Amino acid sequence: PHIDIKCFPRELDEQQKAALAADITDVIIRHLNSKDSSISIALQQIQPESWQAIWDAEIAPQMEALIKKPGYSMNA
Amino acid sequence: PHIDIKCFPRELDEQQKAALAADITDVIIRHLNSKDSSISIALQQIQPESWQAIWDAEIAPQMEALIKKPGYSMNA
């Protein structure tokens, strides 16, 4: 599995990045029956003014297929 | 944060997809100082013969930045 995490900018040191990756890894192993070697994880920082593009391409068009829908909306 | 999970196909019912979403949500809240309302999660099942496109567009180019690198290589 390949997991992509997009979020607003924040400072994460190497220890933080590795711990987040480890917690994500174990969740994926549990739910998808995956092996550790099959998992890759990306963390991409997105500036606030570029979040609309993420909403438009990834969130809004897939809304009822999302496994977790956003509590916020960019189309109010 | 918006989380995208790509994996080879598997039989997952709605309760199973919600349980995966809940565990991912906890991890994101605790590591990114996030809130339930800010989190959206997509799950996309990709047939094995279409994984090369994922390697080429998402995994390989980001190798320098991934927070968890894959345990396999598929450069073609």
Query: Which chain A residues contact residue B1 at CB under 8 A?
Result: 5-7
CB atoms within 10 A of CB B74: 12
Instruction: Name the DSSP class of A55.
Output: I
Question: In angstroms, rounded to a whole number, what is the distance separating the alpha carbons of residues A6 and B24?
Answer: 13
Cα dist from B36 to A19, A57, B26, B39, whole Å = 20, 21, 8, 6
- Tell me the two tokens of residue A49: 């003014």
B21 contacts A19 by C-beta, under 8 angstroms: no
Report the chain A residue with the minimal C-alpha distance to residue B13. A67
Q: Resolution to 1 decimal, in Å? A: 1.4
Identify the CA nearest to B76 among candidates B48, B62, B55, B50. Answer: B55
Q: A32: which chain B residues are within 8 Å (Cβ-Cβ)?
A: 7, 10, 20
CA distances from B7 to B33, B45, B58 (A): 26, 5, 13
Which stretch of DSSP H or E encloses residue B26? helix B14-32
Class of domain A1-64: alpha beta
Count CB-CB contacts under 10 A for residue A44: 12
| Identity of residue B37 | S
Q: How was this structure determined?
A: X-ray
* Closest-CA residue to A24 (of B9, B71, B67): B67
- What is the SS3 assignment for A5-43? EEECCCCCCHHHHHHHHHHHHHHHHHHHCCCHHHCEEEE
Domain boundaries, chain A: 1-64
Neighbour order of strands in the sheet with A40-45: A40-45, A2-7, B2-7, B40-45
Going by C-alpha positions, the residue among A35, A27, A29 that lies closest to residue B30 is A27
- At B60, phi and psi to the nearest 5? -55, -50
Active site residues of B: 1
Question: Do the beta carbons of residue A42 and residue A58 sit within 8 Å?
Answer: no
- The amino acid occupying position A21 is A
Helix (H, G, I), strand (E, B) or coil at A50: helix
CB A37 within 8 A of CB A76: no
